[PDB]
Design an enzyme around this catalytic site. Structure first.
Site, PDB file in Angstrom:
ATOM      1  N   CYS A 180      -0.661   9.780   3.479  1.00 26.48           N
ATOM      2  CA  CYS A 180      -0.820   9.357   2.086  1.00 26.48           C
ATOM      3  C   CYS A 180      -1.907   9.660   1.265  1.00 26.48           C
ATOM      4  O   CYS A 180      -1.892   9.981   0.295  1.00 26.48           O
ATOM      5  CB  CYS A 180      -0.833   7.724   2.235  1.00 26.48           C
ATOM      6  SG  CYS A 180      -2.043   6.915   3.212  1.00 26.48           S
TER       7      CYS A 180
ATOM      8  N   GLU B 190       0.852  -1.254  -0.087  1.00 23.81           N
ATOM      9  CA  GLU B 190       0.190  -0.048  -0.095  1.00 23.81           C
ATOM     10  C   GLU B 190       0.922   1.297  -0.145  1.00 23.81           C
ATOM     11  O   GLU B 190       1.616   1.398   0.848  1.00 23.81           O
ATOM     12  CB  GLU B 190      -0.731  -0.078   1.221  1.00 23.81           C
ATOM     13  CG  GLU B 190      -1.845  -1.126   0.964  1.00 23.81           C
ATOM     14  CD  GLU B 190      -2.689  -1.455  -0.047  1.00 23.81           C
ATOM     15  OE1 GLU B 190      -3.700  -0.621  -0.334  1.00 23.81           O
ATOM     16  OE2 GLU B 190      -2.133  -2.036  -1.109  1.00 23.81           O
TER      17      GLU B 190
HETATM   18  N1  LIG Z   1      -1.392   3.677   0.748  1.00 23.26           N
HETATM   19  C1  LIG Z   1      -1.357   3.745   2.006  1.00 23.26           C
HETATM   20  O1  LIG Z   1      -2.080   3.466   3.040  1.00 23.26           O
HETATM   21  C2  LIG Z   1      -0.084   4.412   3.069  1.00 23.26           C
HETATM   22  C3  LIG Z   1      -0.338   4.914   4.151  1.00 23.26           C
HETATM   23  C4  LIG Z   1       0.542   5.566   4.779  1.00 23.26           C
HETATM   24  C5  LIG Z   1       1.648   5.981   4.053  1.00 23.26           C
HETATM   25  N2  LIG Z   1       1.872   5.477   2.806  1.00 23.26           N
HETATM   26  C6  LIG Z   1       3.067   5.977   1.830  1.00 23.26           C
HETATM   27  O2  LIG Z   1       3.974   5.454   2.840  1.00 23.26           O
HETATM   28  C7  LIG Z   1       5.011   6.633   2.405  1.00 23.26           C
HETATM   29  C8  LIG Z   1       5.646   7.505   3.524  1.00 23.26           C
HETATM   30  O3  LIG Z   1       6.044   6.593   4.701  1.00 23.26           O
HETATM   31  P1  LIG Z   1       7.409   6.345   4.945  1.00 23.26           P
HETATM   32  O4  LIG Z   1       8.423   7.446   4.852  1.00 23.26           O
HETATM   33  O5  LIG Z   1       7.490   5.585   6.279  1.00 23.26           O
HETATM   34  O6  LIG Z   1       7.909   5.238   3.842  1.00 23.26           O
HETATM   35  P2  LIG Z   1       9.206   4.471   3.386  1.00 23.26           P
HETATM   36  O7  LIG Z   1       8.982   3.767   1.868  1.00 23.26           O
HETATM   37  O8  LIG Z   1      10.285   5.260   3.494  1.00 23.26           O
HETATM   38  O9  LIG Z   1       9.229   3.229   4.576  1.00 23.26           O
HETATM   39  C9  LIG Z   1       8.236   2.639   5.006  1.00 23.26           C
HETATM   40  C10 LIG Z   1       9.061   1.358   5.701  1.00 23.26           C
HETATM   41  O10 LIG Z   1       9.742   0.425   4.728  1.00 23.26           O
HETATM   42  C11 LIG Z   1      10.905  -0.009   5.374  1.00 23.26           C
HETATM   43  N3  LIG Z   1      12.004   0.081   4.388  1.00 23.26           N
HETATM   44  C12 LIG Z   1      12.716   1.351   3.780  1.00 23.26           C
HETATM   45  N4  LIG Z   1      13.578   0.385   2.819  1.00 23.26           N
HETATM   46  C13 LIG Z   1      13.156  -0.620   2.928  1.00 23.26           C
HETATM   47  C14 LIG Z   1      13.938  -1.919   2.072  1.00 23.26           C
HETATM   48  N5  LIG Z   1      14.712  -1.876   1.154  1.00 23.26           N
HETATM   49  N6  LIG Z   1      13.246  -3.080   2.428  1.00 23.26           N
HETATM   50  C15 LIG Z   1      12.217  -3.351   3.608  1.00 23.26           C
HETATM   51  N7  LIG Z   1      11.786  -2.272   4.065  1.00 23.26           N
HETATM   52  C16 LIG Z   1      12.412  -0.918   3.778  1.00 23.26           C
HETATM   53  C17 LIG Z   1      11.086   1.416   6.520  1.00 23.26           C
HETATM   54  O11 LIG Z   1      12.059   1.194   7.437  1.00 23.26           O
HETATM   55  C18 LIG Z   1       9.649   1.551   6.985  1.00 23.26           C
HETATM   56  O12 LIG Z   1       9.407   0.757   8.058  1.00 23.26           O
HETATM   57  C19 LIG Z   1       4.552   7.782   1.509  1.00 23.26           C
HETATM   58  O13 LIG Z   1       5.041   7.293   0.322  1.00 23.26           O
HETATM   59  C20 LIG Z   1       3.192   7.598   1.773  1.00 23.26           C
HETATM   60  O14 LIG Z   1       2.085   7.800   0.617  1.00 23.26           O
HETATM   61  C21 LIG Z   1       0.898   4.798   2.079  1.00 23.26           C
HETATM   62  O1  LIG Z   2      -5.998   9.625   5.839  1.00 23.68           O
HETATM   63  C1  LIG Z   2      -6.315   8.599   5.555  1.00 23.68           C
HETATM   64  O2  LIG Z   2      -7.246   8.545   4.787  1.00 23.68           O
HETATM   65  C2  LIG Z   2      -5.826   7.188   6.089  1.00 23.68           C
HETATM   66  C3  LIG Z   2      -4.389   7.279   5.723  1.00 23.68           C
HETATM   67  C4  LIG Z   2      -3.680   5.976   6.215  1.00 23.68           C
HETATM   68  C5  LIG Z   2      -4.592   5.163   7.037  1.00 23.68           C
HETATM   69  N1  LIG Z   2      -5.041   6.216   8.192  1.00 23.68           N
HETATM   70  C6  LIG Z   2      -6.154   7.299   7.428  1.00 23.68           C
END
Ligand SMILES: NC(=O)c1ccc[n+]([C@@H]2O[C@H](COP(=O)([O-])OP(=O)(O)OC[C@H]3O[C@@H](n4cnc5c(N)ncnc54)[C@H](O)[C@@H]3O)[C@@H](O)[C@H]2O)c1
Ligand SMILES: O=C(O)[C@H]1CCCNC1
Ligand SMILES: Cc1cc2nc3c(=O)[nH]c(=O)nc-3n(C[C@H](O)[C@H](O)[C@H](O)COP(=O)(O)OP(=O)(O)OC[C@H]3O[C@@H](n4cnc5c(N)ncnc54)[C@H](O)[C@@H]3O)c2cc1C
Ligand SMILES: [Mg+2]
EC number: 1.5.5.2
Lengths: 1218, 107, 54
Positions: free
Chosen positions: A829, A795
């Site tokens: 996100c 996700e």
């Molecule tokens: N679609 C959704 O529901 C949703 C929800 C929240 C955040 N996000 C996305 O998450 C991003 C921001 O969150 P973030 O900064 O923590 O994301 P990120 O990709 O930097 O890291 C997320 C997790 O992946 C791990 N990670 C990093 N490199 C890895 C690797 N090579 N192998 C395995 N794990 C690795 C990190 O330690 C962390 O636990 C944004 O792009 C946001 O849009 C998506």
């Molecule tokens: O902002 C939102 O709509 C959702 C993002 C990720 C899960 N929590 C809520």
């Protein structure tokens, strides 16, 4: 370094005993509120009989002179349907936007009457049709069927011509200039007031301002009130506050941040403005009334009333007035406070008792916020008793306050008239009514020949634009099923029913004061399915005082996060965790996991897997439910940790903990609905979570995996390990064995080591698309012991757009944009990244948006007044700033808030608006408080939707429009997982807006949705409500073709897939009032088919077609000759692909082959550019043996849509709830 | 058109009226694609006619008609099918296509 | 109104000339009445000066 939470939310003033009694009653159970009101409202049998007789006399007078309305007579004369009546009034409204009369009449005669009105009238004619619908039909329809109205308008003009247009124009002119307002300007209103003043009425002018969005708005409303006070005071000409006219103001008009969270700004900036207006009212000796608004502004407004009444500069003037809403549970205690303030100050406060104008909104708000109860009554009769009880209190205090009984209800009036007794003088008390609504009743009250009691007319003043903005709310005041004015006009309601005594009716109920049967308490929104999480009321001083102490205590704790292996805590590299808003604030210490210990944890999980799988699903779900109770009880402490570790505001921290509770309870209930012995766990699941929802998404993934019977390796984001460690501690306390849930703090290296571990049986990832792609590549190397791909839920990011057309209400849009783009510093996100404004309204909305931007308070989030906190790291800050400066260097207009010097100790990025030429100017998700704005011509709306889809993302999407044709068009063409209509695009609610996108935004299935758990077991169960009666027609054509080829077994399998597919599922999910939450299953798109055998290809095609998809078939399969003479309908869905990377993006894949063929194909698929593909593989023998070799759950796309059905200004469904 | 239905009288006059309830909020997606194609090639009058046809088309109308209890009587407007287009001029063809596509038809 | 009032006589003619049963003849007259009233109402809802006859 300032102590954490030392200044979180100090009250404006110490709360007196009287103020505390108000707060104590805020959400008091309805059964507790009613008995003292019933007692206070009780009158003698003689008074009740006399009141009933007076009420009957007034009602008989009302019904005797009751004529047909002007609109009704117009509809009758021209035989208009309801839609024609509405369309006609919309046309009349638009014609009245033409200021010159001769020009307007020429357009009518020469172009409108005899030709296409459409060719002569950027803005739909029907923007306000919901309002005109209330006028014509008495019923509220939240959105406008503009195509029905256009047809009706063409029909009526072609049938009736200029005469009906003329009549409609004249009617609308009268209604909008003389009925909905007393006049367009204060001078016009004053001129028209003389007639009724001569009869004994008085006036209070309502300038119709409210809800300032910008400083300029508030200044505009201020100068409008100031100019009105001059005109009213000049006209009053020394008549004084009782005989002479006064003014009414709304505090929300005078400051753009009128809220308890901004109380210091309210007292510093709003109060002096009210004082200046009050000083002018004092000089002219006119009344100045503060109107009552939402329940969360009541107590704040008391702080202004107190300061003003104690201000010596206002002494000598008794014109200060204040509204109290009898539908509110605090009403009598507010009156006690006001009466005492009047005694202390010696000011004879003018107290307007009303029932209340915001009822349906208060119900919705309490439900959304998960609060203990409502701040208003839920049965209309309770409000009536409350009103009479409060009138009794006011009539005992006429020496110190001036009661003003605002009501159109003749029964309420009669009760108070007799309660007040025989002795009367002008100045003792008065009645009040609304202009153009209450005069028929009060013409039977005012005057020596009537009841000889005065009535003050609340007189709206304003232009068409101003009056239309919140006319819906005003119409509902007297137009709902329970409204007196509606009932007096209902011939099926008898006078005996109208004169029924609410006090005696309530007294005789089996349970006095019971909640309305048809309104769910917030905790009960989901009924028997699960208990809603509970929030906290940040407008409640008791809650704020309690939270202040809990938050401070949380900051004193030595939070730690350790590698919690099954064998116990492990040693590792330890470092501090710093508050992103102030690096001097050490929140805790994290010991990070060595790659060796991460691999060991997976082996321990693998050894522990059978023992956890053997815990029955009901018991695993019981652990989740116990964890939810623990998080609910621990919420205040959890908030403090989230605030300091993740840089979140308290409001967002509350929502975060609620979401974690909701995930736990939702997955527990989904488990109880589905999981049986045949849904075996995958095995050890690696759960990798992002920093930005460090408790909610963390808990959601782990809870789902655990409850599906899998042991979990939990790898939280390196930025936010402490709240993750606390979540794990809670889950373990709730009964999850240490061997089933291991916490492995650390950076991406720990995540990668866990992903690559041989025993890892599944990966749940939420994070950036780029990291998901690296995980996808690593998993493509691996197969399960059974030789199948390791399931990945990934996700990922969004490039979320909101489209706004010229029918949207700018104030609503701006609020939802500011929230969607800048809440959490844009680190959701779901955050709004691209706002798309229809060209005709773009400049006005942009101006308002920039003004609202500058009202945001950025800083360390341990203060309630902070709206926007820090970004998570200096690297995030640098990345965001590099983007902003790139845009600035390209010449794009950039608007930014100025940051306070206090932000220097943390990592902050100011909320930023960047105006782009084209959506394609934005090339990557910028995960920060950066809103991009583009403009579009209305005819280019479809191209714009293409542009939004063209980014490849598909997470959240918003649309602000009133027009059904636009809703239908945009929602049918947009490709995003979470759609939001007329509301913000953030804060998706578990099980209400199941959350997750498509394309570059996700593989699915959606978290918080019913397909999720089934991804975490080897054989997916049938989710609750998961079926569809619709059969894909191309599937059917393919099944017939198979039969024609003699492939009878495959044709049967194809028909079975057609039936088993849930494509076309279309459900409404339970949720709050005033919102419709829809969940639908659609095709995913184009599925890559990699067959090995003819039968395998036919099975793959059947699965894909049954779920509505098109396919690209690997040409290297050599199976082209197996699809000869396809029906054209099937051929339209079939392409052959030699170069898969050139023929994408795909939305999934089906693979047939032996284990090494599957591995090879999985690597080739992982190498395709763009979205991660949900791949399903099977051997030829598996296809032959297992009808569900390919699971149809993963070949549909879930779409959630949340429509704000209250956006027009009221709730149609709640108009029937009394 | 159907006897006893709302399109019938319109066939018996030289300019058909808009029948009661005759509208649809749905826009044919192929019509929309055609309008964008017309936009791109500068056929402004034709693109406008296409958008207008997309809106005024009642394709997708889906009504329940009043009748006796114990019955649900539904009335729906679907595409006719494949329409024969006999144009003379390019603009005429674009207008014919707009009309046919807006009503869900192939040609 | 006339067909409604004269339905019994119209029934007898339809029964004898067209071979219909009484129930079907009733339905036939009712349908004629309904066409008359339906097209009358549809006219009242739609037709104006620009809808010239053929
Ligand atoms: N679609 C959704 O529901 C949703 C929800 C929240 C955040 N996000 C996305 O998450 C991003 C921001 O969150 P973030 O900064 O923590 O994301 P990120 O990709 O930097 O890291 C997320 C997790 O992946 C791990 N990670 C990093 N490199 C890895 C690797 N090579 N192998 C395995 N794990 C690795 C990190 O330690 C962390 O636990 C944004 O792009 C946001 O849009 C998506
Ligand atoms: O902002 C939102 O709509 C959702 C993002 C990720 C899960 N929590 C809520
Ligand atoms: C002069 C004047 C000034 C006003 N000032 C304000 C103001 O400052 N603030 C404000 O909020 N409104 C204000 N109002 C509106 C007022 O609060 C009511 O909404 C409206 O006047 C209610 O009508 P009622 O008391 O005349 O008659 P009614 O028909 O007797 O009362 C209707 C009221 O019952 C209440 N009600 C309806 N359903 C339920 C339910 N299911 N449970 C509990 N209660 C229910 C609502 O308050 C509703 O408006 C004012 C009205 C007037 C005439
Ligand atoms: Mg990262």
């Amino acid at each position: 370094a300032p102590a954490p939470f030392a200044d979180f939310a100090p009250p404006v003033r110490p709360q007196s005993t009287l103020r505390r009694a108000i707060t104590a009653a805020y959400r008091r159970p309805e059964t507790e509120c009613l008995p003292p009101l019933v007692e206070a409202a009780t009158q003698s049998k003689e008074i009740r009989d006399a009141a009933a007789s007076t009420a009957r006399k007034l009602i008989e007078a009302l019904r005797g002179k009751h004529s047909g309305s002007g609109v009704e007579g117009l509809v009758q004369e021209y035989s208009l349907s309801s839609q024609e009546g509405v369309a006609l009034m919309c046309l009349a409204e638009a014609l009245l936007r033409i200021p010159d009369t001769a020009t307007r009449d020429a357009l009518i005669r020469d172009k409108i009457a005899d030709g296409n009105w459409k060719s002569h009238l950027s803005r739909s004619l029907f923007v306000n049709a919901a309002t005109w619908g209330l006028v014509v039909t008495g019923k509220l329809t939240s959105t406008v069927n503009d195509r029905s109205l256009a047809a009706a308008l063409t029909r009526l003009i072609s049938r009736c011509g200029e005469p009906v247009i003329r009549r409609g124009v004249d009617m609308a002119m009268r209604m909008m200039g003389e009925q909905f307002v007393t006049g367009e300007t204060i001078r016009e209103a004053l001129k028209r007031s003389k007639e009724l003043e001569e009869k004994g009425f008085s006036y209070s002018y309502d300038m119709l301002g409210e809800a300032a969005t910008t400083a300029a708005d508030a200044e505009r409303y201020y100068r409008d009130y100031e100019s009105a006070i001059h005109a009213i005071g000049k006209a009053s000409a020394g008549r004084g506050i009782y005989e002479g006219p006064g003014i009414s103001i709304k505090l929300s008009a005078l400051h753009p941040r009128y809220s308890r969270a901004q109380a210091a700004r309210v007292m510093g900036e709003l109060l002096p403005r009210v004082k200046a207006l009050a000083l002018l009212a004092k000089n002219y000796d006119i009344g100045l009334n503060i109107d009552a608004e939402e329940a969360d502004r009541l107590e704040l407004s008391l702080d202004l009333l107190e300061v003003l009444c104690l201000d010596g500069d206002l002494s000598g003037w008794n014109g200060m007035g204040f509204v109290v809403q009898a539908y509110g549970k605090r009403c009598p205690f507010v009156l006690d406070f006001i009466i005492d303030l009047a005694r202390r100050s010696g000011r004879r406060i003018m107290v307007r008792l009303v029932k209340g104008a915001y009822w349906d909104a208060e119900i919705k708000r309490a439900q959304l916020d998960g609060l203990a109860d409502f701040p208003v009554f839920t049965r209309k009769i309770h409000t009536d008793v409350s009103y009479i009880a409060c009138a009794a209190k006011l009539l005992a205090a006429t020496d110190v306050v001036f009661p003003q009984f605002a009501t159109h209800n003749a029964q309420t009036l009669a009760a108070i008239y007799h309660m007040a007794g025989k002795d009367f003088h002008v100045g003792k008390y008065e009645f009040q009514c609304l202009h153009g609504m209450g005069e028929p009743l009060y013409e039977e009250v005012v005057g020596r020949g009537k009841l000889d009691r005065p009535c003050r007319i609340y007189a709206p003043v304003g232009t068409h634009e101003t009056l239309l903005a919140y006319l819906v709310r005003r119409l509902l005041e007297n137009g709902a099923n329970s409204s007196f004015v509606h009932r007096i006009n209902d011939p099926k309601v008898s006078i005996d029913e109208l004169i029924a005594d609410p006090v005696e009716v309530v007294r005789a109920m089996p349970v006095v004061g019971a909640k309305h049967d048809r309104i769910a308490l917030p905790a009960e929104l989901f009924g028997d399915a699960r208990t809603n999480s509970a929030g906290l009321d940040l407008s409640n001083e008791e809650t704020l005082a309690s939270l202040t102490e809990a938050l401070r205590e949380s900051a004193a704790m030595k939070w730690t996060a350790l590698p919690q292996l099954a064998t116990g805590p492990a040693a590792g590299e330890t470092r501090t965790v710093l508050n992103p808003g102030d690096h001097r604030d050490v929140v805790g210490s994290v010991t990070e996991t060595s790659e060796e210990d991460a691999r060991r944890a997976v082996r321990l999980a693998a050894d522990a897997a059978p023992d956890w799988a053997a815990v029955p699903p009901s018991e695993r779900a019981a652990c989740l439910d116990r964890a939810a109770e623990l998080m609910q009880a621990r919420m205040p402490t959890l908030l403090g940790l989230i605030i300091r570790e993740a840089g979140k505001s308290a409001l967002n921290a509350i929502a975060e903990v609620r979401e974690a509770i909701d995930f736990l309870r939702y997955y527990a209930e989904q488990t109880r609905r589905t999981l049986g012995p045949g849904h075996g766990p995958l095995g050890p699941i690696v759960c990798i979570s992002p920093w930005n929802f460090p408790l909610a998404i963390f808990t959601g993934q782990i809870a789902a995996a655990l409850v599906a019977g899998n042991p979990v390796l939990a790898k939280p984001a390196e930025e936010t390990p402490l709240i993750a460690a606390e979540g794990v501690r809670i889950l373990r306390e709730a009964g999850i064995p240490a061997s089933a849930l291991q916490l492995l703090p650390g950076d991406g290296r720990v995540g990668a080591a866990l992903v690559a571990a041989a025993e890892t049986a599944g990966v749940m990832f939420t994070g950036s698309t780029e990291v998901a792609r690296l995980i996808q590549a690593q998993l493509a190397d691996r197969l399960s012991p059974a030789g199948r791909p390791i399931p990945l839920i990934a996700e990922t990011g969004g490039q979320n757009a909101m489209i706004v057309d010229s029918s949207a209400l700018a104030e609503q849009v701006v609020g939802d944009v500011i929230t969607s783009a800048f809440d959490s510093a844009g680190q959701r996100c779901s955050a709004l990244r691209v706002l798309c404004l229809q060209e005709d309204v773009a400049d006005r909305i942009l101006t308002m948006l920039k003004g609202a931007l500058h009202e945001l308070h950025i800083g360390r989030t341990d203060r309630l007044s902070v709206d926007v906190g820090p970004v998570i790291t200096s690297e995030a800050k640098d990345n965001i700033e590099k983007h902003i400066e790139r845009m600035r260097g390209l010449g794009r207009k950039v608007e930014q808030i100025g940051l306070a010097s206090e932000t220097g100790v943390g990592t902050f990025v100011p909320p930023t608006i960047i105006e782009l030429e084209k959506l394609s100017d934005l090339q990557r998700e910028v995960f920060g408080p950066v809103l991009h704005v583009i403009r579009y011509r209305r005819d280019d709306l479809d191209r714009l939707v293409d542009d939004v889809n063209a980014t490849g993302y598909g997470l959240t999407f918003g649309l602000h429009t009133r027009l059904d044709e636009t809703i239908a068009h945009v929602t049918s063409r947009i490709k995003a997982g979470n759609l939001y209509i007329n509301r913000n695009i953030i804060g998706a609610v578990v099980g209400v807006q199941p959350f997750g996108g498509r394309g570059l935004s996700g593989t699915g299935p959606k978290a918080g949705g019913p397909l999720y758990l089934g991804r975490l077991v080897t054989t997916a169960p049938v989710p609750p409500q998961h079926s569809s009666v619709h059969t894909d027609p191309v599937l059917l054509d393919f099944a017939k073709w198979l039969d024609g080829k003699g492939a009878r077994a495959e044709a049967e399998a194809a028909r079975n897939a057609g039936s088993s597919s849930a494509l076309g599922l279309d459900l409404e999910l339970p949720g709050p009032v005033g919102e419709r939450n829809l969940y639908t299953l659609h095709a995913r798109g184009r599925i890559l088919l990699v067959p090995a055998t003819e039968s395998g290809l036919y099975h793959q095609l059947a699965a894909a077609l049954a779920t509505g998809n098109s396919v690209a078939i690997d040409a290297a399969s050599g199976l082209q000759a197996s699809l000869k003479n396809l029906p054209q309908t099937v051929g339209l869905r079939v392409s052959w692909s030699k170069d898969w990377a050139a023929d994408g993006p795909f939305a999934g894949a089906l693979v047939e082959g032996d284990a090494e063929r599957i591995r090879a194909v999985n690597k080739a698929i992982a190498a395709l550019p763009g979205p991660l593909l949900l791949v399903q593989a099977a051997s030829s023998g598996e296809i032959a043996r297992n009808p569900d070799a390919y699971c149809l759950n993963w070949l549909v796309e879930e779409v959630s849509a949340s429509i704000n059905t209250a956006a027009a200004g009221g709730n149609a469904s709640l108009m029937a709830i009394g």
